[PDB]
């Protein structure tokens, strides 16, 4: 798991976190996670320990040792935790939940209580860390995007569309374009002004892409920044070229038959180390490794009793 | 105990209402005699003398017999029922059979399987003909639940309008809009729903795209009359007369006369009214109106009397079912 350069952790409602192997696709080990499911998995940049976000507790499991107990279980939160960030330094951990209060935690510090709190109006559905390590993107059920500066605490509230729940938002590593997605299925993209010290971070709306008809769950830019994956409840993970915003590849898990209702949602997207492959989770209990250019299931991961709702992927050397 | 039953089933030699009624009486009496339940079997002698006794016990006797039959007499009886319903249909026998079918639907046994789909279509046609619009709506709704089609929607709208439910019919149109867009919606639906403005728009676009046709012309003209735009109606009438065949001319004359009367062009009004057939209530009414305009009071009174004589049938038929 930890020794292997590729880490792929998958979990859902079954109270277990399973670390698969990309080369083979065999469950190396499982970690128990009781009292709740997991809402989001994330590997620290240092790769020392993974983090699991569930309900009211933020657990962090070791990656190198096998079969450990939760090393850190940050309690003291209510109303679930939707997603978790991670500072590149590895000092600060960013989290957000439905209590409308994004929280900043110090891993090095012993203090159980968080360090900084950003309270908003609507429940927080996503949190994303800008690559510059100076601003935090916070979504909400009301659809108001907030850009929380980590140094001046000047939050700029922007609402792309009134009264629509924003579900996920991500920014490419180059900070060129930012994508946000809501329950309507639209994929809003904003150009980022080249400002670091001035903190202007002005968002210029570029295009409103009708990505999906039903609820859209998650989006993420590829490391090369030329690709943007977008999942939804339509059981189709759509892929758009950043230069043109056109559907180059459509990854669908549809049964190909009208006699099939509610096969399972798809809310997972993870580009490979060089963006050749893409890992996608699904509610069919089966994660799938797709080929970006061809759009075929190179390998399939199975063994989860209940629906798969999270994923992890990291090719750092 | 199925010989006289089979004879009653596969007889099919009735050419009169009394013959089919006698078949119904024989069927009811035989069902009472063959009924397994002694309580039902005891009323056969009374039902022979009194027909309402047989009619009231018809459903229970049929249930007992149908439960007894080992699916083969059931098949034969079902086929006989299909023959009776489809061929030589009669109002009383049809109503009795429809009540039987409703009773079976209510019972735990299940509906009688008639020509597949439990005879949803055939029962709907029969209920509509016998003016049991509630049953017709129920069967048509079941057909809709099995599958929605524009024909089913049209029949549903017609049944609802005949049932004095314009709100429900408008809901049907809304469903048609959301699911089938606009092409599948014929302007006749708006015309039935009295959404005359929407019907007028639909007729205008259909005329713009598809070449002018007598049916579209008549539909748009009807919408014009309903709105009251006599100027446009009369303009269309004057524009298209020699291009019109005689049947479409007879259909034209009524609306043309209405427009001419609205505008006060009495010469055109007389021209159109002469073309209206005499055997129509509207024709008699407009002839009387012209007689009043020309002060031909005696001929007006005679024509009004003829109009009432014609209205006898329509008024009686409509007053037969509710006010």
């Amino acid at each position: 798991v930890g020794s292997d350069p590729v880490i792929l952790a998958t979990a859902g409602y079954d109270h277990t976190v399973r670390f698969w192997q990309a080369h083979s696709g065999i469950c190396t080990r499982t970690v128990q996670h009781q009292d709740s499911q997991v809402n989001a998995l994330e590997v620290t940049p240092d790769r020392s320990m993974i983090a699991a976000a569930g309900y009211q507790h933020i657990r962090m499991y070791d990656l190198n040792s096998n079969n450990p107990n939760p090393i850190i279980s940050y309690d003291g939160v209510n109303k679930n935790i939707a997603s978790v960030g991670f500072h590149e330094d590895g000092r600060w951990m960013y989290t957000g939940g439905e209590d409308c209060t994004a929280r900043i935690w110090d891993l090095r510090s012993r203090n159980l209580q968080c360090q900084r709190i950003f309270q908003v109006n609507a429940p927080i559905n996503c949190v994303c860390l800008h690559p510059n390590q100076a601003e935090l993107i916070v979504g909400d059920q009301s659809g108001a995007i907030h850009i929380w500066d980590l140094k001046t605490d000047h939050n700029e509230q922007l609402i792309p569309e009134p009264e629509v729940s924003i579900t996920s938002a991500h920014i490419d590593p180059d900070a060129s374009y930012m994508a946000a997605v809501n329950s309507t299925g639209n994929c809003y993209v904003w150009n980022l002004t080249g400002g670091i010290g001035d903190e202007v971070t002005q968002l210029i709306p570029k295009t409103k892409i009708p990505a999906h008809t039903r609820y859209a769950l998650q989006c993420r830019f590829s490391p090369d920044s030329t690709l943007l994956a977008t999942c939804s409840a339509d059981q189709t993970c759509k892929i758009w070229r950043t230069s043109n915003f056109s559907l180059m590849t459509e990854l669908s898990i549809k049964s190909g038959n009208p006699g099939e209702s509610s096969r399972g949602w798809m809310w997972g997207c993870a580009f490979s180390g060089d963006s050749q492959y893409i890992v996608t989770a699904s509610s069919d209990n089966l994660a799938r490794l797709w080929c970006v250019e061809t759009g075929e299931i190179k390998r399939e991961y199975g063994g989860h009793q209940k629906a798969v709702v999270c994923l992890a992927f990291n090719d750092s050397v | 105990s199925t010989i006289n039953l089979q004879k009653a089933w596969g007889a099919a030699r009735r050419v009169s209402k009394d013959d089919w009624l006698e078949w119904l009486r024989r069927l009811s009496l035989e069902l009472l005699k063959d009924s397994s339940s002694p309580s039902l079997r005891s009323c056969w002698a009374l039902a022979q003398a009194y027909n309402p006794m047989a009619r009231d016990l018809f459903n229970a006797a049929f249930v007992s017999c149908w439960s007894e039959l080992n699916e083969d007499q059931q098949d034969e009886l079902i086929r006989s029922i299909e023959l009776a319903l489809t061929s030589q249909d009669i109002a009383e026998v049809t109503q009795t059979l429809l009540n039987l079918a409703e009773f079976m639907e209510h019972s735990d046994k299940g509906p009688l399987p008639l020509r597949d789909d439990n005879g949803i279509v055939l029962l709907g046609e029969r209920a509509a003909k016998c003016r049991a619009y509630a049953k017709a709506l129920h069967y048509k709704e079941l057909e809709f639940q099995k599958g929605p089609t524009p024909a089913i929607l049209e029949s549903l709208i017609s049944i609802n309008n005949k049932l004095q439910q314009p709100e429900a019919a408008a809901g049907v149109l809304e469903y048609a809009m959301k699911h089938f867009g606009e092409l599948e919606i014929q302007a006749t639906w708006y015309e039935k729903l009295h959404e005359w403005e929407d019907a007028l728009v639909a007729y205008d676009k259909k005329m713009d795209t598809n070449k002018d046709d007598p049916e579209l012309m008549l539909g748009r003209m009807r919408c014009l009359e309903a709105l009251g735009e006599w100027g446009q109606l009369h303009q269309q009438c004057c524009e298209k007369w020699t291009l019109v065949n005689d049947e479409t001319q007879a259909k034209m004359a009524r609306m043309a006369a209405a427009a001419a009367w609205g505008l006060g062009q009495w010469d055109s009004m007389e021209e159109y009214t002469c073309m209206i057939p005499r055997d129509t209530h509207d024709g008699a009414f407009y002839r009387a109106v012209l007689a009043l305009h020309q002060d031909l009071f005696s001929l007006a009174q005679q024509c009004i009397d003829k109009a009432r004589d014609l209205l006898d049938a329509e008024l009686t038929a409509m007053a037969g079912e509710s006010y």
């Binding site: 629906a307 | 209510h106 129920h138």
Partner: protein, 684 residues
């Protein structure tokens, strides 16, 4: 008013226009009503302006003069409007009560009020009897004496319309309320004294039936155990326990009380003795002994409680069994026009319904020979239900007045409600009806379908559903709905209906009544519409709503399991309507009802404001909060925005069809539905 709006310049011109209109037509009701409403609005506007400016000496006196100058015209116009209307004066009467209770302490306003009271007929005041009695103990003696005189007249003419609420007032904990009630009652006794005595004994015996001594001990011991083992509040423990011992001190009065004293009375007295020993000593060993006895009797009464299926009057209260041919009128039945239906006799047996509150099933016999069944509710306030029923009466009158609503036969099913105390009261029992939950359960049992199939499916997919996030919840809910056929209600309706014609009539009535109650409930801010809280009539098919415990967005405000659904619009009801869905009868009826209510926004606002500003009903708002005036103003503003159509967006006004569409989308939205408490049955 529509164009310029409301401000300093508009009021004098509008007053001139309305005064000239009244001068040109004295007998016109609309002119006088509009003039009075305009003056009342001007009074409110000036009051709010002075509140916003001065609060945030001479200015106060200037406002006093200006408001007094604007008030008397309002009072006179309202009185003349009532006299002209003669039958549709509910709004005007409530406005009169508001002006009276607010500015009646001024001698000039009091003079206008007394003159208007003398001119007006007494029959009108029967409509606002609860509002009048809500302010029996108003601190202002000038207003109080006029209220007392008016109620004395109401006692003289139509005494039966006052005896029940007067009796309820007489037994109030606060001294002033019971003092005023007894002061009115002594004057009434010189008139009859017999309606008085009968009403008193009836109310006492009915309360005794509603709550039995062992039941009082059970609930008190439950609160006591929560106080001690949960909160360690020994002083509150003694405060809760002592009234029960004080009620023991009266001694047994009936066979049931004697038996309870024989069985438990000795143990309770012992426990009180040990409590007193603890009081003088403070010993855990002294208190634990009383605790052991309390838990012993608690277990005994807990075992005995299920066996109390039915209550016979000879044990519980032989006085009611004695009652025969009482002149006392049947509750909720007196009408100034119809003959008085006086009680003939009370049935000896009461069939207790096995519910959490254990409501009795009382049934009286009237002089006309027709049984009147009622439900005896204990430990629950019914004044809120009384005000809600008054509002429903107004809405029914408005719907009857409207031609389209009258054509469609739109109406709200209502039942007589008669409060008996702060805890207990009487509820009219509607016949030929059953809870939607009961119908669903019976049909599913008949069809061998698991009752909680949807919950079992969602739990199987995700055992952590309650702790799932929003998107996981909605996905789970969608899976459960898709993999379940939600036609149980429609199928059971069709099976229950005898013939297709009656079936169609029933379905039409069901859809229309459901739409009417949905719109009225949304305007009223009524929530917590779980299937047990609404009932379906098995003959007419009309929808009925009961248990208006939460109103004015209480479910939305409460932090635990908040409800985001304005009114219950679940998929099973949607299927129970026409096959097309909501786009037909439901939507059109909603359009008509919303149009009618928006038309009569002034009347609806008057009715709502009266019992929102009522002090006796402010405890609900205070409990919801976490002062009083800001909360009342806020909720009134919210409902005003609902009626105007600016609720969804303050800046943008919304028309009736668009607002109805948005309400339907909000009610049917899966994201909004999956937030609802599982017991509310969103999947159903």
């Amino acid at each position: 008013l529509n164009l310029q709006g409301i401000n300093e310049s508009t009021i004098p011109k509008v007053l001139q226009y309305y005064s000239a209109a009244t001068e040109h037509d004295r007998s016109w009701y609309k002119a006088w009503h509009a003039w009075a409403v305009m003056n009342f609005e001007a009074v409110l506007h000036y009051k709010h302006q002075n509140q916003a400016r001065d609060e945030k000496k001479k200015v106060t006196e200037d406002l006093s003069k200006t408001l007094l100058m604007y008030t008397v015209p309002a009072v006179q116009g309202f009185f003349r409007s009532i006299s002209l209307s003669r039958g549709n004066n509910l709004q005007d009467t409530l406005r009169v009560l508001t002006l009276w209770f607010d500015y009646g302490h001024w001698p000039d306003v009091n003079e206008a009020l007394v003159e208007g009271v003398k001119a007006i007929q007494i029959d009108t005041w029967l409509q606002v009897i609860p509002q009048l009695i809500a302010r029996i103990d108003t601190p202002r003696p000038l207003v109080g004496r006029l209220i007392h005189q008016l109620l004395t007249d109401i006692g003289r003419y139509h005494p039966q319309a006052l005896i029940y609420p007067l009796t309820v007032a007489s037994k109030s904990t606060t001294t002033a309320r019971h003092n005023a009630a007894n002061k009115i009652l002594k004057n009434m006794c010189e008139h009859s004294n017999t309606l008085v005595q009968q009403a008193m004994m009836v109310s006492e015996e009915l309360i005794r039936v509603a709550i039995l001594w062992h039941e009082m001990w059970h609930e008190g011991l439950e609160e006591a155990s929560r106080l001690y083992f949960g909160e360690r509040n020994v002083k509150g423990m003694f405060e809760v326990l002592e009234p029960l011992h004080a009620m023991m001190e009266r001694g047994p009065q009936t066979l049931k009380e004697t038996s309870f004293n024989q069985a438990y009375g000795r143990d309770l007295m012992e426990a009180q003795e040990w409590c007193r020993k603890y009081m003088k000593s403070g010993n855990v060993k002294d208190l634990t002994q009383a605790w052991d006895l309390y838990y012993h009797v608690f277990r005994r009464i807990s075992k005995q409680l299920p066996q109390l299926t039915s209550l016979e009057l000879q044990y519980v209260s032989p006085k009611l069994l004695m009652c025969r041919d009482l002149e006392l009128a049947v509750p909720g039945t007196y009408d100034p026009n119809q003959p008085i239906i006086r009680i003939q006799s009370i049935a000896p047996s009461l069939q207790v319904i096995t519910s959490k509150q254990r409501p009795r099933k009382l049934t009286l016999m009237g002089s006309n020979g027709h049984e009147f069944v009622f439900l005896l509710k204990g430990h629950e306030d019914l004044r809120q239900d009384e005000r809600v029923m008054q509002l429903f009466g107004l809405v029914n009158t408005l719907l009857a007045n409207d031609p389209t609503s009258l054509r469609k036969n739109l109406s709200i099913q209502r039942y007589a409600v008669i409060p008996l105390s702060t805890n207990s009261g009487l509820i009219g029992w509607v016949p030929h009806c059953d809870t939607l939950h009961a119908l669903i359960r019976d049909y599913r049992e008949k069809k061998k379908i698991l009752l909680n199939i949807e919950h079992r499916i969602m739990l199987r997919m995700a055992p952590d559903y309650d702790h799932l996030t929003l998107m996981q919840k909605v996905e789970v809910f969608e899976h459960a709905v898709n993999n379940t056929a939600g036609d149980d209600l429609a199928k059971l309706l069709w099976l229950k209906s005898p013939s297709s014609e009656v079936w169609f009539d029933r379905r039409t009535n069901y859809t229309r009544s459901l739409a009417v109650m949905s719109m009225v409930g949304y305007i009223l801010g009524l929530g917590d519409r779980h299937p047990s809280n609404l009932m379906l009539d098995r003959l007419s098919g009309k929808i009925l709503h009961i248990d208006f415990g939460d109103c004015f967005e209480v479910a939305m405000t409460r932090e635990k399991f908040p409800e985001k659904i304005p009114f219950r619009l679940t998929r099973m009801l949607t299927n129970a309507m026409e096959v097309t869905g909501l786009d037909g009868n439901y939507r059109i009826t909603c359009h008509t009802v919303m149009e009618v209510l928006r038309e009569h926004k002034d009347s609806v606002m008057a009715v709502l404001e009266a019992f929102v500003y009522d002090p006796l009903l402010n405890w609900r708002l205070m409990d919801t909060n976490t002062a009083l005036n800001k909360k009342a103003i806020q909720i009134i503003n919210r409902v005003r925005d609902k009626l105007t159509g600016r609720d969804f967006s303050h800046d943008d006004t919304l028309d009736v069809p668009t607002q109805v569409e948005l309400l339907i989308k909000q009610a049917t939205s899966h994201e909004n539905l999956c937030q609802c408490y599982i017991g509310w049955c969103p999947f159903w």
